[PDB]
Amino acid sequence: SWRHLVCYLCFYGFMAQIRPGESFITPYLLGPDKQFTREQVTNEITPVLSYSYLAVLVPVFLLTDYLRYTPVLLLQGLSFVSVWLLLLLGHSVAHMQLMELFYSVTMAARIAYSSYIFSLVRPARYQRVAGYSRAAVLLGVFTSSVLGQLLVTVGRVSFSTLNYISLAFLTFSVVLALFLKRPKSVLARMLRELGDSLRRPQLRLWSLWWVFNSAGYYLVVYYVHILWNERVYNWAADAASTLLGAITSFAAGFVKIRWARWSKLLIAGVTATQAGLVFLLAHTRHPSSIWLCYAAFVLFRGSYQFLVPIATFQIASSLSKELCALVFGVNTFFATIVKTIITFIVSDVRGLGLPVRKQFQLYSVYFLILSIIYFLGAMLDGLRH
Numbered sequence: 001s002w003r004h005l006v007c008y009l010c011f012y013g014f015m016a017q018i019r020p021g022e023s024f025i026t027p028y029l030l031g032p033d034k035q036f037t038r039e040q041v042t043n044e045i046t047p048v049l050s051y052s053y054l055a056v057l058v059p060v061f062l063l064t065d066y067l068r069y070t071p072v073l074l075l076q077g078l079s080f081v082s083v084w085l086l087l088l089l090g091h092s093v094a095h096m097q098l099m100e101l102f103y104s105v106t107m108a109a110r111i112a113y114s115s116y117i118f119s120l121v122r123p124a125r126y127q128r129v130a131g132y133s134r135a136a137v138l139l140g141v142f143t144s145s146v147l148g149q150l151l152v153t154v155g156r157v158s159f160s161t162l163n164y165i166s167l168a169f170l171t172f173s174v175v176l177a178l179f180l181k182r183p184k185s186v187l188a189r190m191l192r193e194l195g196d197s198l199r200r201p202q203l204r205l206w207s208l209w210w211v212f213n214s215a216g217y218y219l220v221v222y223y224v225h226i227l228w229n230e231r232v233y234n235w236a237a238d239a240a241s242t243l244l245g246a247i248t249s250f251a252a253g254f255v256k257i258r259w260a261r262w263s264k265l266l267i268a269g270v271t272a273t274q275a276g277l278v279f280l281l282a283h284t285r286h287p288s289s290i291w292l293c294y295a296a297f298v299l300f301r302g303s304y305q306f307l308v309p310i311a312t313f314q315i316a317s318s319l320s321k322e323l324c325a326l327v328f329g330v331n332t333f334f335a336t337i338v339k340t341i342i343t344f345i346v347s348d349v350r351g352l353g354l355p356v357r358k359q360f361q362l363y364s365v366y367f368l369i370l371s372i373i374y375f376l377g378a379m380l381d382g383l384r385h
């Protein structure tokens with residue numbers, strides 16, 4: 001299986017992220033297809049995603065490496081199929097809450113594929129496979145967005161037919177996941193090994209990056225989404241951003257930079273670049289600079305997605321046991337915790353309610369201080385002689 005091991009896995013990663021009808025879930029609900037209201041979707045349906053995500057991210061990471069990453073990938077595929085079954089056949093708001101819960105389950109289980117990538121290949125070329133995997137996933141997301149948008153805009157396709165197409169694609173993704181090769185008080189032993197592994201320098205630094213920079217990137221992405229929502233150029237920017245992320249993840253898969261040294265400077269410079277990109281993003285105004293702003297966000301996802309195929313790799317090379325998925329899940333869970341803490345701090349009305357521009361200035365400052373802390377840490381241990 002020289003061709004059936006990593007090529008097939010990246011093929012499945014690409015085809016499992018194809019969902020032409022995913023990007024139009026809201027407008028499909030708000031129309032002469034479900035007869036929903038904006039208030040119903042934005043109170044009783046959308047927050048169910050957040051509730052379920054920061055509840056189901058825990059068991060998924062806790063047991064995902066125990067059952068060898070294949071059954072939970074099949075569960076993610078079946079959960080996408082269940083999401084689209086609820087979408088095609090759902091009237092009460094309870095069914096849409098169930099659909100949001102299942103979509104949250106898939107979002108939680110993405111880490112399972114992220115770690116199954118490392119569980120398959122031999123622990124030597126981890127980086128070159130992480131890059132390929134992230135590139136395949138981002139190509140899948142970009143293809144899904146492009147296909148859905150061109151099907152609804154260039155062609156004349158009703159949302160029902162698009163959702164049927166997406167259901168067929170998800171069924172094929174489940175069929176593809178069926179054939180994946182399954183690799184070879186447990187909680188106390190796992191926690192002890194987790195604490196033992198966190199003492200390593202590279203794993204510690206990159207886990208901190210995943211906890212903080214990923215949370216910042218999620219916050220920035222969601223708030224650019226709401227800011228642009230608050231039109232064809234929106235999908236154009238999102239698709240271009242995903243494409244640049246895929247290209248940069250492939251490049252990171254090809255990167256040869258040493259990691260014992262010349263690594264903290266790398267993360268510091270990448271985070272500083274992200275801070276500058278958000279800095280430019282916040283202060284765009286009525287003039288055509290918005291177009292230039294449209295580029296900056298793309299470069300934003302051209303930076304964070306340049307480090308995920310590296311970070312995961314650098315965590316896969318520092319975990320002696322087969323706990324490469326528990327650490328990824330802990331990092332994602334804590335990133336979600338940090339993101340929701342910040343959202344409670346600023347986004348909510350009961351919190352420090354500020355305009356979106358103020359939020360983006362605050363995120364620029366937060367990325368800048370993260371990069372400054374990383375730079376200070378790099379300089380503190382620079383000599384050690």
Ligand SMILES: CN1c2c(nc(N)[nH]c2=O)NC[C@@H]1CNc1ccc(C(=O)N[C@@H](CCC(=O)O)C(=O)O)cc1
Pocket residue numbers: 017022023025026041045046049100103107110137141218221
């Ligand atoms: C279905 N969800 C939803 C909706 N719209 C409504 N009205 N209700 C919903 O529940 N639109 C899609 C949304 C899903 N929300 C999200 C949240 C995060 C990501 C997300 O993780 N995007 C990745 C892109 C790359 C990838 O998929 O791996 C990211 O980097 O943020 C996707 C959808």
